[PDB]
Structure formats: C-alpha cells, structure tokens
Amino acid sequence: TILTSGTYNDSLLTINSDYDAYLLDFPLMGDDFMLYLARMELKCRFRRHERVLQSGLCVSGLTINGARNRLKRVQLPEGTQIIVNIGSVDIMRGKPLVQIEHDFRLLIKEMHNMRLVPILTNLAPLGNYCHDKVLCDKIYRFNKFIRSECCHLKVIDIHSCLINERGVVRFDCFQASPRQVTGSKEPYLFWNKIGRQRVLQVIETSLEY
Secondary structure, eight states, rough: OOOTTTTGGGGGOOTTTTSEETTEEEEEEESSHHHHHHHHSSSSOOTTTTTOOTTEEEEOOOOOHHHHHHTOOOOOOOEEEEEEEEOOOOOOTOOOOOOOOOOOHHHHHHHHHTOOHHHHOOOOGGGGGGGGGHHHHHHHHHHHHHHHHTSOOOEESGGGBOOTTTTTTHHHHHHHOBBSSSSSSSSOOOHHHHHHHHHHHHHHHOOOO
C-alpha cells in the first residue's frame, strides 16, 4: 500500500552477474524453472535475506504481475535486454487465460516504458500435469499468444524440445518426483540434467548471432 511503500529490501534494487541469475550477460527473469536452470547450469547464488528463493529477477512463485512489480523494484541501464520465462505460475495457480494474456500484455508494455527489452521464451510443458488437458490447452494457447503478441520481439520456442515426435512430453527430460517450492503450493516437476541441457541449448543457439 501507500503506507508501506519503499520498505522492501534495497538490495533488490540492483542485480549483478557475479551472484544473480544471468545467461551470457543477459539477466534472467523467471520462476522456479529458470531459477533451477540457473542454479544447476549457470552458477547463480540465492539471495541470503529473502525467505522465498530467488536470484536476481528469477523468483520462486513469480507470476506475470509479480514480474511487473519486481521490475519496478529494480534499476537497470536503459536498453538492458532480459531473457524472460514467465507464466507457468499463473497457469499452475489456475488463473483464467484471458487474465494471463491481459497481464502479459501489460508486462510487455511496462517493460517498453522502462526501456527494458524482453527476449521471450515460451513455456515448457508442465511434466506432472500431462493428464490435465485443460491446463495443457492453456499452455498451448498462451504460447501461441506469446508468438503473436510479441511478433516484434525475439521469441524462443523452448516448449518444442521437451515434446517428442509423437507429441508426447519427453519424460526422460524430467525428474522422477515432484518437489515442494518456497513461493507456491503447487508441486513442480523439474527438468533433469538432459532437460536442462536441451533448454539451455535452444536458448543459446537462438541468440548466437
């Protein structure tokens, strides 16, 4: 609220590639999925003073609105390009698709206002939610929305590398059991070593030149 404004941890105002989640000098923004990828593959460290796990702009339980709020609480040079993977939490929390798209449209617009350039990744499939056709349909439609809404921006399809030729999720790219996370109550099925490598490869090769 107005009363409590500005009482957040001032250490959140700045990020630094020495400790925070970065990929090839691009700050990373996302939820537990990107956070975990950064922890395993990119040597990131968690912030000591926050009870919710986070590293830079990667925050456990980060929704699209969370991301919108987080960026207001960060200060980066104009023209800074940020690799974004956001929306899985919104879908897991069962937010209405129309609201998800509404929020995402506002995030993009707000980043423009802040002179921050999003490099978008679409959403990986949620491995433990395969039997939920509604949720899977939401991922499909949201990913299609990203591709159209962000037609002027770089959009990286990471969803495809985790699906087989038959259209089934590659379970050999995911861990065997779900995990509890700090920022949300829903169970997460994390990408295993093979999953992480595949996703990381897609991202890197899409930005090489």
